[PDB]
Amino acid sequence: GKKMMTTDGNTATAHVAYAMSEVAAIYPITPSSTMGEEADDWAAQGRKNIFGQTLTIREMQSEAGAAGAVHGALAAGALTTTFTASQGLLLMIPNMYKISGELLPGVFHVTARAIAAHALSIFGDHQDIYAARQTGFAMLASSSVQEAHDMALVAHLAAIESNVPFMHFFDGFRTSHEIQKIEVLDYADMASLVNQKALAEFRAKSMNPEHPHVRGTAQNPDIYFQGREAANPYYLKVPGIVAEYM
Amino acid sequence: GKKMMTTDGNTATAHVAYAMSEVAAIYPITPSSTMGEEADDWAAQGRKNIFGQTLTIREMQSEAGAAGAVHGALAAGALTTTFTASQGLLLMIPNMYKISGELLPGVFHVTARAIAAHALSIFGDHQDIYAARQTGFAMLASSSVQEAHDMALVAHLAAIESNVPFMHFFDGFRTSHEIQKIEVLDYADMASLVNQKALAEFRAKSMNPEHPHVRGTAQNPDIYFQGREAANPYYLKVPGIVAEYMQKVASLTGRSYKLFDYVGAPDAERVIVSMGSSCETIEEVINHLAAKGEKIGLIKVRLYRPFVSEAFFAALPASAKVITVLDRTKEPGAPGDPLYLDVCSAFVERGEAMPKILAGRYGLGSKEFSPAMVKSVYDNMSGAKKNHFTVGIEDDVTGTSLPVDNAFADTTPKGTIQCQFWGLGADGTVGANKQAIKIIGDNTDLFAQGYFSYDSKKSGGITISHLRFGEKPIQSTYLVNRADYVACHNPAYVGIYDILEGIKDGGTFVLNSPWSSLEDMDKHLPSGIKRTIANKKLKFYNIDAVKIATDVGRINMIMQTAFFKLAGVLAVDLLKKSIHKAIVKMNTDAVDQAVTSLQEFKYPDSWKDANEFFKNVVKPILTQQGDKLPVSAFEADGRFPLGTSQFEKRGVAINVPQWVPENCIQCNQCAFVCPHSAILPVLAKEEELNFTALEAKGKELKGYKFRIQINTLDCMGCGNCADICPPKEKALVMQPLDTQRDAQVPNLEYAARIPVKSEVLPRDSLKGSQFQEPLMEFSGACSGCGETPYVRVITQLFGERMFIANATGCSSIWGASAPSMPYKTNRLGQGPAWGNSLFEDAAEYGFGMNMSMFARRTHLADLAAKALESGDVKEALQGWLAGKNDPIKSKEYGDKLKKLLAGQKDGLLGQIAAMSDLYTKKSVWIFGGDGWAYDIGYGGLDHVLASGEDVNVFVMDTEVYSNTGGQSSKATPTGAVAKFAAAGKRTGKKDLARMVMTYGYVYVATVSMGYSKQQFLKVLKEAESFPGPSLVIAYATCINQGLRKGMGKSQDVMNTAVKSGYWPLFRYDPRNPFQLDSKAPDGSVEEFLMAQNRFAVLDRSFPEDAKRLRAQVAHELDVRFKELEHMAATGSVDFGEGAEFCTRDDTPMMARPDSGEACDQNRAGTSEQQGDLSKRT
Amino acid sequence: GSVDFGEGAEFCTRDDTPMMARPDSGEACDQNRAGTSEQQGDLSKRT
Amino acid sequence: WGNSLFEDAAEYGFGMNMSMFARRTHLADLAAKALESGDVKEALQGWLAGKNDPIKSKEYGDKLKKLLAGQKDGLLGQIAAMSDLYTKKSVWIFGGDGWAYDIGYGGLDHVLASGEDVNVFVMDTEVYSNTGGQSSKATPTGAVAKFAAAGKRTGKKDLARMVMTYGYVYVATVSMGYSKQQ
Amino acid sequence: VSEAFFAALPASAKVITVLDRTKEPGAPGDPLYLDVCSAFVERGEAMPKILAGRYGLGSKEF
Ligand SMILES: Cc1ncc(C[n+]2csc(CCOP(=O)(O)OP(=O)(O)O)c2C)c(N)n1
Ligand SMILES: Cc1ncc(C[n+]2csc(CCOP(=O)(O)OP(=O)(O)O)c2C)c(N)n1
Ligand code: SF4
Ligand code: SF4
Ligand code: SF4
Ligand SMILES: [Ca+2]
Ligand SMILES: [Mg+2]
Ligand SMILES: [Mg+2]
């Protein structure tokens, strides 16, 4: 379904994320505000995701709020994405721990931006993405605009299948805003790549009063270690999923 | 200036931090709240730092606020410290980046606590500290209490000198709370260690208008790299500073530390590299194995960041061939845990011979790390080496566990006494044991270690205490497992738990038991315990201490006497004098009668010859034996099933109520009121049925028998029901449990099978609502908790279609503490969908639920609209589509659709039948306390509650941080005594309701159940009915409020709270939108305040302050209600298109692909002025 | 000045959970498990 | 001038307030210890009594900085060491609609309910002016912004009326184009 | 995944520089350098020279 368009990394990534998501909670932060703004633009116009619905976009009071709303939408059984940059990612980490702890299949699209240490900065480096290795997200990187499109698609598919949340990151103000002529896939072509069995399973295990479960308990020295060590198979399976979807 | 005191890690660290700081901004978080609380205590008393001033302590709304306040105090030139734990540290990291970026010399004291991944946890591991390596802090670690004191001192001195902020961390609930006898330095001695030149320089370079500078700029690709790379010298200098200050402190105390320390055989081949309290236990194990010729050792890491390979290799013996790097963290998918990566990088950068390096996980969530596990780690090194293992748990999902032999003999050094004290909560066992440790420490030359295991259950929980008293210093940093002396303070446990699993051969076993006879012990002592006592030749001492205490007119003193005469550590004179220091005659008589009463029991020799989920996991977890549970038992995502509290059956109340059927007026208020749902209104038919039932009254209750069944085993004995029972001759009378359980347990077992009649009466009504099944039953809340009845009524109205976003607080501690889940599924199986995200983001979690449900039901609507194009299915689909916003119509037509579309798995119809759980409209609820709604999760709550989406938030306003030790909130009202309000809080209650009411599109209503139950019910119904945001704040009572008559008066107290005008009731309905449901104040505010222990203490301390504060409270509630009466009496397009001027700058923060079209930049003047300039020229 | 809202109260102002543990805490106290003070007096009188 | 972060400017300013409070109390204790030449005693008493007034504190701080020139010994040397703490300081918190309204709101509310002498000035542009003009809570009803492309449906966040519920906070709304004297 | 990393890495490679766009004060190395070093330690085979370099901080030109 390859069609050529001339866009930057924000547009290339937001195209695929709009296709592959139904819920998006976004806080504005440079250089990632473009993806959320154009997603809200397309939602207002009426663009349809792979499931044939307009993507539901909401704006939070913070990026902590964006990560929390992402957690709620993933827990309730909706495909969720968010767009992030540095200070946003720092505010997002503690909820990313919960998102990977519950094995919820979200995709964060992060534009690499400096962390304010001696001075605030909006430009690109990998400090924010490296600050989030421990959270348990899978982390995918894109070198160019074409690779941003391809890797955003791979991240969404592998997040659906693997039940491990993904962070997709491309360089800020070096890929986010560099116009380039790239071929993108038609939404019909990327729709056929979804693992329908995994999508149905993901909707089944989600929070719902008809089949209720308790998520978010408080545990004591006795059983916390086992609940930590019981999520290893999903991580042993995610890399093969990423390779196969590549 | 060394003085000996017996304290835990919190006290040892807060001592030094108080000396070395002048400003401290603190948020409460377990296990670090103690340091801040005692710092505020000393500030209120008047303790002086090294500079001779009381330390200025403030409390923030969050730990982000604590880190920001720390930044401001460091920037303005004050020595600043803060105390942190896991979630706090995660919220602190982004400001820690700024603090290290500006080279500001702060010290954070972090207690290591788990990060909530699959479940919240308050216990110890290094996940939070490892999450903060990148921030640029220097990171110092302390193995024991003495090392916590020393390392806190070193951290403050090196932070002052090096201009690099420091993080000091010690293990949480393993060093934070383990009492030990340590020598501390006098403040005069630690004052002389400060580098005065560096302190003066630090004050000079700080933010001040007299010598102003710009800090916090915004830089561009051109110069940011250099400003990053210009801070390298300070980090190249900090490690030498830390080493030199270790030397300077060691000169004073006599204990020498290095950046990396080595303990063990110099010619050792198997070396563990560790960090934290485990370094103690391993050392102890080494001191065992070294006596058997073992060539093993240990490297203890003190300075984690910056990592200095020079020190590491100076510690590492060159004969070492295999190294295991033990880490208390899990990073999913990382090539290794952080310390392993650091050691590997050190060996790669050296380039010399590279020994074998192994990585292992241990002690996650303060999981035990015992000598046997250390031995197994060394054995793994010795042969059949395994990389990336876990030690301590039985892994069976990925095979990453070492085998552990649990027959490792006593490694604790000879000369030590081990004591286990099992007790029932608040029977005074831990208080008596702390007194014992303090007495022995102050009066002898023995080191006294004491650890206190607790329980998740607030009322009636078990409390285990492990005490060691040794001539040599106590390095055993783990729970006792082979005890010299066991003491059971509650005979109820003798069947419920294994009291003698930690006994030794001949170990004295002292049992509290009324049955002090040969035959009665034969009848009551379980065969297993009898066989143990007979076989291993114990010294069994049985005493009935309750009779002794009742005679002398609290079993604390008899038990302490039993310890002081039977432990062997010493005693009689010491305990007598200690009682004298603290009526007196009764205590000494109890001491002497206990002295006479203790005698060995001549046991019989024949004594040596004598759902499914619950049965598998929950019963073993409850009996404190889930350490044997493998990893196959636990869900990968950490979810737990509902309805686990139902099989608890814990009869811990002393007094349970009895129903007197003759007086009952069948009002259903004792059920509406009960906090643990031990009251079951059984409404039956005559053909359906000791089980005395009445004739139910009213037209709806025509042929029904009525009964009020008491859940005798699941009763907490709070007396709320009996105190609320209307008839002046009480239909409910509190009677001893032993005289009412035997005839009431079978009655409830029978009554559990009567169908619940939920259609006879509406659920909006009091009696009818109580005629519906409660979906939140048997919490772990405190007996008489003022929060559980509200949530139980909410689930009785909405439990079938409900999402709960539960903030962190008591709501989450009793709503889910593994393995007990009060929430349960109804007969159809549709329970509440309960989830806890974090403390600060419950609101955003619930809002996200709302968005997900909105999206999926719109997708369902689109599918149904596509399926409109058999006639019955068309009618069902149209009926659902029209009325999907009504829960009743949506439920009806969803049932219709689920009947019609059975097995439909093809096409649009198959798709529509696929999501059958989205038919009936769902009610997402947000449950949290005063702290969440008021302090930390406030911004998210405000945003979700101003967005306009149909979400409902219920506030359990206990006016305090009830869950965490009762610290001040913003709900904490004027003149209230709490933590961080020791003199009485001076700021008023946070007017959260009046804040939200300013929006005008939010339903706001305040409720109190003790006052009126009908207003609460109407409020719930019209809150879930409002198509928009809805906020409801419920006055709730907590045991921290110190009700002087008891928690049974909760409702009464609740009632009084609304009569006096302290807690008005009102409803703001946007659909005069405001209205007052509450009457004018009665003027009885002083009685209500004096009724609660906080104001009683405030009076006992400062009467003039207390009376002024109470006057201001009365005046402010008068004017607040005066204000209430004053106001109750009466498509896509962009904003930048087609504008003459630019709506966008040219900065990169405002760049988009559409932008860039030429436009007028307001640089040639206004349009009118431009026209004038054109006209004139 | 310093004083704690838990001193000199007939009932416990603290649970036994680890989230509410301090070195001062642990003194024996009534846990609201035998009923209210008035109801306790009534039970004592009747028996 | 200092910028901390977007969400924590309020806590940064509050921390400034605490640091200044602590250091000036330490100065007060030093001066009270130095009370026990007569001109220095009069200067110190005059500053101690009127350290809460910026004008009197400035006057007597100038007096003290004249008297204690080069004094580098004892209590007097210590008192002369911190000559930048004489005149009472005014800590200000400057931020826009987004900070005061959306993200730094909790910290602002806490510092502005604590009761300590801090002053916060809101440059309410009704929008996230810095970042592309996205919707705020100050963004009023029927306004077109980013994430309000069809016109915002929720009203302005009544921040002033929220804070005024405390009753111990000075709240005042200003507009310079309307009147400069107010 | 060290399997993929070593499948990419040519066996004739003798010197590796791991470029990172981050600064961690006091860390033994930046995160990607530590990952590659751990991969080579866990392989146990010949260990080429591994160098670490910083570049492009704050969208600095590279
Ligand atoms: C960010 C963060 N800081 C601190 C804590 C520790 N904590 C857990 S519950 C709680 C207090 C809960 O307050 P509130 O909402 O009033 O609840 P309740 O009093 O009903 O327990 C605190 C401070 C935490 N979990 N997360
Ligand atoms: C946590 C975080 N999220 C997002 C940003 C990006 N950001 C910088 S300024 C700004 C908006 C500022 O809003 P406001 O207070 O109204 O300021 P003004 O409109 O006057 O510029 C945003 C979103 C940030 N710096 N930090
Ligand atoms: S509260 Fe008393 S009168 Fe009312 S139903 Fe219960 S037992 Fe009967
Ligand atoms: S209200 Fe209290 S005393 Fe009555 S049944 Fe419930 S827990 Fe027991
Ligand atoms: S809110 Fe208070 S009474 Fe209720 S469980 Fe928590 S501490 Fe106990
Ligand atoms: Ca509603
Ligand atoms: Mg509370
Ligand atoms: Mg603005």
Numbering used by the authors:
A (entry chain B): 2 to 247
B (entry chain A): 2 to 554, 558 to 574, 579 to 590, 598 to 625, 636 to 714, 720 to 899, 903 to 1104, 1111 to 1169, ...
C (entry chain B): 1184 to 1230
D (entry chain B): 864 to 899, 903 to 1048
E (entry chain B): 309 to 370
Question: How did the manuscript describe this experimental structure?
Answer:
We subsequently prepared cryo-EM grids using our anaerobic setup. As many as 180,868 particles were used to calculate the final 3D reconstruction at an estimated resolution of 2.90 Å by applying the gold standard FSC criterion. Calculation of the local resolution indicates that the protein core, which represents about 83% of the volume of the reconstruction, is at a resolution between 2.75 Å and 3.05 Å, while the most exposed loops at the surface are at lower resolution ranging from 3.05 to 3.55 Å. The most significant difference corresponds to a rotation of 1.6° between monomers when compared to the D. africanus PFOR crystal structures and up to 2.6° when compared to the enzyme from Moorella thermoacetica. The largest disordered region corresponds to the first 14 residues of domain VII (residues 1170–1183), which consists of a domain-swapping extension. In addition, the Cys1195-Cys1212 disulfide bridge, the Ca2+ and Mg2+ ions and the thiamine pyrophosphate (TPP), essential for the protein activity, are clearly visible in the cryo-EM reconstruction. More to the point, the three [Fe4S4] clusters are also perfectly defined in each monomer with high matching density (up to about 15 σ). The four iron and four sulfide atoms are observed in all clusters, and all of the metal ions are bound to their expected cysteine ligands. Only one of the cysteine ligands of the distal [Fe4S4] cluster displays an alternative conformation never seen in the published X-ray structures. The cryo-EM refined model is very similar to previously published PFOR crystal structures, especially for several PFOR features ([Fe4S4] clusters, TPP, disulfide bridges, Ca2+). The only notable difference is an opening of the dimer interface in the latter, which is most likely due to crystal packing.
